[PDB]
Amino acid sequence: TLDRVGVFAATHAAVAASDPLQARALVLQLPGLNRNKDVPGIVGLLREFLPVRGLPSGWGFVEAAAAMRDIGFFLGSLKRHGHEPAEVVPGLEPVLLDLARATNLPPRETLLHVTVWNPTAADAQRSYTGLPDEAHLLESVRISMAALEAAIALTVELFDVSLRSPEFAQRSDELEAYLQKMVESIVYAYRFISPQVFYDELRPFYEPIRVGGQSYLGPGAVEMPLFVLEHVLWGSQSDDQTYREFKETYLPYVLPAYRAVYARFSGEPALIDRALDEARAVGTRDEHVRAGLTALERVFKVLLRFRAPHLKLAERAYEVYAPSMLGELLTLTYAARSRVRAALDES
Ligand code: HEM
């Protein structure tokens, strides 16, 4: 049914299958050293595979991204025990910067590296902690990342589809179906991830580190390119300070293609702004207009079925505090949906 997922999943699998540093058996030893808080051992283990002669000239994106993944687990690890990886590992910084250049991504590990680009097998999956809860968190992202990428494609396609077009409602219904995966992810997370374990054992691995004279954030699901999708859909012309700063903060961590999508739509009304103008130009009693707007409201419904439960998920973990950004974004989503619902009012 969600047949657009396959191609995105296949691109992720290419990186997951790559191990140019032949680091698999070495990275698997990291959880034990983390448990032992063995900083010298962690550095020693990294130096067993860290390139010292520059990157192999034959590497492409796949190899460079795979190398960053495997070095990357040592970065959040070292910071977890209170150390800047660049300061305690001679020659590491130049490698990170070279890998950043090769991939057009930050000079550390991102959500992509630790989830969809990380192999799934027990004898291959890289992990900070080796904990089941960490594996469950990775799975929760794997459930929806490829679907979300399809959804970004669909949103961009829907942007050029007139509300007057016969496809509008059908495309919106298809977008809704892919976005349902985000809901599935939060249901999964609620079921399988212990809030105590997340907060006490996993969260400390996700601190920022300093590379190239600036701070780079840790992997988190916050880096999923959902914010790019919603920039196009409803948010591009939002003057809300917290929201704009949120998007600009996470922009460097998403794939270059989605950074390009973001830029393309920043100088234009968002999809719903255009659709609502169209509804007003035709008249909101027109059944085809109403069909389109109703379909659009369902997209907002599914976005809220992710976002509201996610806030609860986040609150439960931090009860063991969540940033204001979450509730603020939730409210903005409600406001956007309300604009659609207002057009559908029959009085
Ligand atoms: C117990 C598990 C989780 C916790 C504790 C958690 C916590 C948070 C927090 C605190 C934020 C605000 C930004 C930050 O400080 O990093 C955030 C944002 C975000 N998270 Fe989660 N999260 C969890 C699971 C998930 C899952 C499973 C997904 C999707 C697969 C997800 C998707 C997102 C997204 C897309 C944002 C950006 C804000 C938004 O769209 O509303 N999170 N998360």
Does residue 101 sit in the same domain as residue 197? no
- Which DSSP category does 179 fall into? H
Does residue 77 sit in the same domain as residue 141? no
Taking the CB of residue 171, how many other CB atoms lie within 10 A of it?
Answer: 18
What is the C-alpha separation between 32 and 39, in angstroms, rounded? 11
What is the C-alpha separation between 290 and 199, in angstroms, rounded? 45
125 occurs within a structural domain: no
* Helix/strand/coil (H/E/C) assignment for every residue in 117-170: CCCCCCCCCCCCCCCHHHHHHHHHHHHHHHHHHHHHHHHHHHHCCCCCCCCHHH
Q: Which two tokens stand for residue 4?
A: 């657009």
Q: Which two tokens stand for residue 280?
A: 């007003």
Q: What is the resolution of this structure in A?
A: 1.8
121 occurs within a structural domain: no
Does residue 168 sit in the same domain as residue 100? no
- Per DSSP, what are the bridge partners of residue 215? 210
Q: Which two tokens stand for residue 88?
A: 């305690």
Q: Which two tokens stand for residue 337?
A: 């949906």
Angle at which helices 5-16 and 61-80 pack, to 10 degrees?
70
Does residue 286 sit in the same domain as residue 241? yes
Which structural domain range is residue 25 located in?
1-115
The type of residue at 300 is: F
Taking the CB of residue 93, how many other CB atoms lie within 10 A of it?
Answer: 17
Kindly report the protein residue whose alpha carbon is nearest to atom 13 of ligand 1. Answer: 222
Write down the experimental method used for this entry: X-ray
146 lines ligand 1 (CB under 6 A): no
**DSSP states along 19-54:** -TT--HHHHTTHHHHHHTT-HHHHHHHHHTT--SS-
The verdict on whether residue 221 carries a ligand-binding annotation is yes
202 lines ligand 1 (CB under 6 A): no
120 occurs within a structural domain: no
Does residue 199 sit in the same domain as residue 102? no
197 lines ligand 1 (CB under 6 A): no
* Ligand 1 atom with least separation from CA of 137: 27
CATH code of 32's domain: 1.20.58.1320
322 lines ligand 1 (CB under 6 A): yes
Angle at which helices 324-343 and 287-318 pack, to 10 degrees?
160
Does residue 290 sit in the same domain as residue 331? yes
Does residue 188 sit in the same domain as residue 96? no
What is the C-alpha separation between 99 and 106, in angstroms, rounded? 9
Does residue 18 sit in the same domain as residue 161? no
Give backbone dihedrals phi and psi of 215, rounded to 5 degrees, phi first. -100, 135
Does residue 106 sit in the same domain as residue 147? no
CATH code of 289's domain: 1.20.58.480
CA 82 to chain centre: 26
Does residue 136 sit in the same domain as residue 281? yes
Does residue 182 sit in the same domain as residue 245? yes
Does residue 61 sit in the same domain as residue 150? no
What is the C-alpha separation between 27 and 64, in angstroms, rounded? 16
Burial class (CB in 10 A: 0-12, 13-18, 19+), 251: middle
Residue with tokens 């959040």: 76
337 CA distance to ligand 1 middle (Å): 21
The type of residue at 55 is: L
122 occurs within a structural domain: no
